Structure 1
Amino acid sequence: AKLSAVRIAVREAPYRPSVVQFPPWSDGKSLIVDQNEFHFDHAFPATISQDEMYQALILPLVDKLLEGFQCTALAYGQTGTGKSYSMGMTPPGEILPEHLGILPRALGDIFERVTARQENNKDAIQVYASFIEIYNEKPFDLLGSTPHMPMVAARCQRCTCLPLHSQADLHHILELGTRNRRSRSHAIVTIHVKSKTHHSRMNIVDLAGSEGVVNINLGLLSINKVVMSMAAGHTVIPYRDSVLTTVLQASLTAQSYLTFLACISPHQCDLSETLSTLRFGTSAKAAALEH
């Protein structure tokens, strides 16, 4: 079948004249770059805080995750545009409160709802985290004993999930994974919600820089093909088109959720990279149709 929802958001990175224009009159989901008009589900200016961005874009997915639906939030775009910052890939301990990203905020709300529903509980719920890195189209388990050893025919499921009981634990897995981490490197930190009969995932994806100079991009790219193939029901999904779509195969299924976060530079010198990132958003936006 089709995914439950495919959403696309854009976040303007802080300015160091911005090429990004937010029209005086708009629905808050539009922007203009190099005279081109872009329309997505969310358009966040450089002034939007982490809290607001998380509340608008990710919080809604928390209930879905708890209900058993697979969820994926993926940041993409040029290096230095705030992808890691937005997703919260840096160990929480060494981060100021207002700067905390999506990962720590999501985990916080997950624990809260799990503790609030652990009495009108059917079964018990346990939370875990996995940290996978894709270096040159090769999956690596950053939480295992061989973080520098490629995976095959098992990166889809067989990969260490470490227990999560508090933010401190998240800090541990992020610190551990970061150390065991080694010309593109994508990161996929997944919050796993497991019960005796259910397993839902919240995949927080932080892709490597999309700038140029199979083709650097290709994942997400491959992601759009997957989204389309499912809609038109090609009765064969190109999951193996890339390591990204292979690792997230279990999450790229019917009544799963996919949210894109395009991070863009407001600098004129990055116009070309920004346009590339926004054009991809438009394409993923069209592929999200029929879903």
Structure 2
Amino acid sequence: NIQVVVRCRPFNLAERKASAHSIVECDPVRKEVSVRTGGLADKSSRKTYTFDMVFGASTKQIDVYRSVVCPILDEVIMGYNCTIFAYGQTGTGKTFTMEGERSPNEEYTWEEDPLAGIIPRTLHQIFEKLTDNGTEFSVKVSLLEIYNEELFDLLNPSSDVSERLQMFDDPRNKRGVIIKGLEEITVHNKDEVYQILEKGAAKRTTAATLMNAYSSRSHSVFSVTIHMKETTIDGEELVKIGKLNLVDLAGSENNINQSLLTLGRVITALVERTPHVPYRESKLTRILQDSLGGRTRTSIIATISPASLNLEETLSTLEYAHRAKNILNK
């Protein structure tokens, strides 16, 4: 049930000029990734895994979006709940994947940059889709980040990143949480997106001066909520609410990250079919507990490096990603 894809990034200019050796080969037609744990490219021992989809170094953002996100966006628009996670070591591409970057020299606008990642392609698509069709809809967004088991709002322009939100259980619906103070921002039109993100990109900067290795050690939850009051030609007014959470996890490398530790432990309990799952043992797992064995539809995108220095981290990721394939939800 939980879909897992592996994205492998190309050798960085640091490993480019250093003219090194790939220990990872990604076969998109075989949905398989293979790591060389031994030696010699003439004779080598290897480790091989199979996923739902693998994308090699030559994969572009649009490729990823078209293949994995687009189908999740369609389910969300229908009124369902979906979740996407980016898992993996630091410096392998979790952020390039969920956010993407800007092509240099102001070459493109935000909506056409080949480098844009999931989050911005999605926000744009939403408008591009519902706007056409005859629907009254509304988009809300939230960016909730976890650093050291403390909760932060990176979108609220009124309060600074030094003020942590509180989390309490939701008396109404069980297994839900209430985040006191989280700002939900309404995005009135496409040409109103980029600023919302620029503010986020700004506030995360101060968050970095305030907390060590923030960008590595924090988990961000980008949530977009769609309220659609559709009315097809028939004049049928369907009231749909779709929610999508885009999660860029802290770096899987190895103080302690209670949520990352709790995530893996939660995954274990679900694959090992154990009755007790430690959702409550971290903020991340309690917040997104429905994405993990609940009724949300979830995908994981693990990110790895071709580099041989990363061997250990790559097998740790490939492996962690592999077992999750066994989590069944919806």
Corresponding position: 1:171 with 2:171: no
Residues 131 and 228 of structure 1: is their aligned pair in 2 closer, same or farther, counting only changes over 3 Å? same
Residues 39 and 253 of structure 1: is their aligned pair in 2 closer, same or farther, counting only changes over 3 Å? closer
CA contact (8 A) 1:222 1:241 kept: no
Provide TM-score, normalisation by structure 1.
0.84
Q: State the SS of the aligned residue for 2:183.
A: coil
Residues 262-289 of structure 1 show CA distances to partners (whole Å, capped at 9, x for unaligned) of 1101000111111111110112112x24
Corresponding position: 1:147 with 2:161: yes
Partner of 2:115: 99
Deviation at 1:15, TM superposition (A): 1.0
Partner of 2:32: 30
Moved more, 61-70 or 161-170: 161-170
Partner of 2:137: 125
Which runs of 5 or more structure 2 residues have no equivalent in the other structure? 13-20, 38-45, 104-108, 169-176, 208-212, 230-238
Residues 168 and 133 of structure 1: is their aligned pair in 2 closer, same or farther, counting only changes over 3 Å? farther
Partner of 2:282: 242
Residues 75-104 of structure 1 show CA distances to partners (whole Å, capped at 9, x for unaligned) of 111111111111116579679711111111
Provide TM-score, normalisation by structure 2.
0.75
Higher RCO (CA-CA < 8 Å; seq separation 6+): 1
Corresponding position: 1:7 with 2:8: no
Q: Give distance in 2, aligned partners of 1:22 and 1:90.
A: 23
CA contact (8 A) 1:29 1:39 kept: yes
Residues 59 and 95 of structure 1: is their aligned pair in 2 closer, same or farther, counting only changes over 3 Å? closer
Q: Give distance in 2, aligned partners of 1:290 and 1:208.
A: 23
Equivalences for residues 1-291 of structure 1 within 5 A: 5-16=1-12, 17-22=21-26, 27-33=29-35, 34=37, 35-88=46-99, 97-117=113-133, 119=134, 121=135, 124-144=136-156, 145-154=159-168, 156-158=178-180, 159-181=182-204, 182=207, 183=213, 184-195=217-228, 198-212=240-254, 214-215=256-257, 217-225=260-268, 227-228=270-271, 234=275, 238-249=278-289, 251-252=291-292, 254-286=294-326, 288-289=327-328
CA contact (8 A) 1:201 1:251 kept: no
Q: Give distance in 1, aligned partners of 2:263 and 2:224.
A: 20
Residues 167 and 206 of structure 1: is their aligned pair in 2 closer, same or farther, counting only changes over 3 Å? farther
Residues 170 and 246 of structure 1: is their aligned pair in 2 closer, same or farther, counting only changes over 3 Å? farther
Q: Give distance in 1, aligned partners of 2:179 and 2:30.
A: 39
Q: Give distance in 2, aligned partners of 1:215 and 1:131.
A: 19
CA contact (8 A) 2:111 2:124 kept: no
Q: Give distance in 1, aligned partners of 2:179 and 2:80.
A: 16
Q: Give distance in 2, aligned partners of 1:195 and 1:220.
A: 32
Amino acid at match of 1:81: T
Structure 1 moving runs of 4+ over 6 Å: none
Percent sequence identity is 34
Q: Give distance in 2, aligned partners of 1:167 and 1:290.
A: 33
Query: Greater share of strand residues, 1 or 2?
Result: 2
CA contact (8 A) 1:226 1:239 kept: no
Residues 161-191 of structure 1 show CA distances to partners (whole Å, capped at 9, x for unaligned) of 1112344433222221222221511211111
CA contact (8 A) 1:138 1:150 kept: yes
- The CA RMSD over aligned residues, in Å, is 2.8
Deviation at 1:62, TM superposition (A): 0.8
The alignment covers a number of residue pairs equal to: 277
Q: Give distance in 2, aligned partners of 1:30 and 1:206.
A: 23
Deviation at 1:195, TM superposition (A): 4.5
Amino acid at match of 2:282: S
Q: Give distance in 2, aligned partners of 1:168 and 1:225.
A: 43
